[PDB]
Amino acid sequence: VQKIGILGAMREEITPILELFGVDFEEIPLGGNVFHKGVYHNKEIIVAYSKIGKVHSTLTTTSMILAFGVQKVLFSGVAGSLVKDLKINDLLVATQLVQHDVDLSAFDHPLGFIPESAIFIETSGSLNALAKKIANEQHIALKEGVIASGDQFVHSKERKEFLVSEFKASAVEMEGASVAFVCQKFGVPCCVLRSISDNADEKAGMSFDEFLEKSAHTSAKFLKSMVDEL
Amino acid sequence: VQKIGILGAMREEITPILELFGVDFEEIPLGGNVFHKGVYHNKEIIVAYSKIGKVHSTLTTTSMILAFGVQKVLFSGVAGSLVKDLKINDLLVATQLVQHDVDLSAFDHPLGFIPESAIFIETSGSLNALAKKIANEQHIALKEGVIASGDQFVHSKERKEFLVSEFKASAVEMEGASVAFVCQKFGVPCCVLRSISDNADEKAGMSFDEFLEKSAHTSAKFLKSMVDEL
Ligand SMILES: CSC[C@H]1CN(Cc2c[nH]c3c(N)ncnc23)C[C@@H]1O
Ligand SMILES: CSC[C@H]1CN(Cc2c[nH]c3c(N)ncnc23)C[C@@H]1O
């Protein structure tokens, strides 16, 4: 009855999701994505990886909503940490997201702002509160904070400093803001969950390669614990 | 019978389109866009402005296809010129588009490239050939070339030089690549038509403010001449 959309960006982010749910899935191709449709604890779950970045994730989220009719979207994957207290493997949920690479400052718009929109996009307070409740019960740390999304893999101190000073972001990735944006437009509750894979600095490529699979699994496990309480 | 989606990014880009078609439209809100649905020369035309940038335009294009079932998408609006022979008011059609702000070079991917995708996205050769035919018959210049799209308003010589050297782009805007990308994914013919509003340099904000309305109208008139032959 209840339909839940579950998104990662990369195949690596959804492999553990499919395995952890442990049910059979039907594969349904649409718009260049493969949607895995299954039934788990009396809910219909629709799982897909968008492919990397803002256009990919916007498209996939829109398809989930318009073609599959999902009633909530939960994103699970990895991210770069912009703050000392978010270390490799640590989880956070996005309270707000921003498109950090948006620049219409030639017209004196604030960075991140587009006319007829807003700098910050909100996620579901109800889903974030559920995550927090579960994290406390499992004795797991969970941070809440701003996630910055853009179409670059960030791997420099200079870009980190900008994201922190301009947007007070705690983490960086390439999809969350676009997912939450679409959801907002269609009145669909959204939760963006990430596990830290790297520190978004000069060493980030190397850290990401090392920790992608473990961090993806950490995020996937937690997302499943949320779906278990929905 | 035939359904044609018509897109601009800004309200200013579709105002002349609605006026030039000169028919009644029904307004249908969806996903934060207003779709203007009318009948013109025995075709159903669905007109909308996406709002600025790649996420907005991806969403709107996806809605056009999935919710309204359009069989072709024609984009009309303004752009920054990256080449001397494209002057203010001049028209071009995009042969290919690129997301110029995509950077996964930390993993030695070429700029503009995302895994499971491609740097360049093609548009409809058939629609481009129609534009060329019409332009020749009307004795209007029409260039064909690469259009670069990103989420920044480009207003610097340094960024222009990069777009020309890296992608051999002739023009820059913030929506075309995302529109053509979605269309490709759903097998929908796409044509991206632009009229030059500025030179994407330090003076671009000022040129854009001056020429937006005239350049939008130039593009809109031409798009209508295409729809007249479809
Ligand atoms: C192969 S591209 C990176 C993929 C992993 N996703 C999140 C991410 C982790 N670290 C990041 C960083 N330093 N900068 C931006 N994004 C991220 C984004 C994209 O799907
Ligand atoms: C208010 S933002 C600019 C709007 C006009 N569209 C095209 C465009 C013209 N000149 C451009 C330039 N120098 N750099 C990028 N884009 C453009 C993009 C956006 O909708």
Catalytic position from the list A166, A198, A202, A209 = A198
Scanning chain B, the segments in alpha helix (DSSP H) are 11-21, 54-68, 125-137, 157-167, 176-185, 204-229
Query: At CB < 8 A and 24+ separation, what contacts does A208-215 make?
Result: A208/A78, A208/A80, A208/A153, A211/A78, A211/A88, A211/A89, A212/A10, A212/A12, A212/A78, A213/A12, A214/A89, A215/A78, A215/A88, A215/A89
What domain range includes position B120? Answer: 1-230
Answer yes or no: is the C-beta of B163 below 6 A from any ligand 2 atom. Answer: no
- Cα–Cα distance measured from residue B207 to residue B82, given in angstroms and rounded to the nearest whole number: 14
DSSP secondary structure string for all residues of B29-95: EETTEEEEEEEETTEEEEEEE--SSHHHHHHHHHHHHHHH--SEEEEEEEEEE-STT--TT-EEEEE
**Residue A31 to residue B107, Cβ atoms within 8 A:** no
Please provide residue B187's backbone torsions phi and psi, each rounded to the nearest 5 degrees. 65, 35
Judged by DSSP in three states, B13 sits in helix
Task: Identify the residue whose C-alpha is closest to ligand 2 atom 6.
Answer: B173
Our answer on whether the CB atom of A170 is closer than 6 Å to any ligand 1 atom is no
Asked if B103 reaches chain A (Cβ–Cβ under 8 Å), the answer is yes
Closest chain A C-alpha to B209 CA, distance in angstroms: 10
Q: From start to end of A31-187, where are the E strands? A: 33-40, 43-49, 72-81, 91-99, 121-122, 142-149, 169-173
Distance CA B7, CA B14 (A): 7
CATH code for the domain of A134: 3.40.50.1580
Experimental method: X-ray
Q: A200 in ligand 1 pocket by Cβ < 6 Å? A: yes
List B residues 124-183 in contact with A (Cβ-Cβ < 8 A): 150-153, 155, 177-178, 181-182
Taking the C-alpha atoms of residue A51 and residue A10, their distance in angstroms, rounded to an integer, is 5
Amino acid at B5: G
For residue B106, the distance in angstroms to the closest alpha carbon of chain A comes to 6
Interchain pair A106, B52: CB under 8 A: no
Residues 6+ away with beta carbon under 8 Å from A191: A72, A73, A74, A75, A93, A94, A123, A124, A127, A128, A131, A226
User: Out of B27, B198, B210, B228, which one is annotated catalytic?
Assistant: B198
The total domain count for chain B is 1
A67 close contact with B: CB closer than 8 A: yes
Report angle CA B113, B115, B117 to the nearest 5 degrees: 70
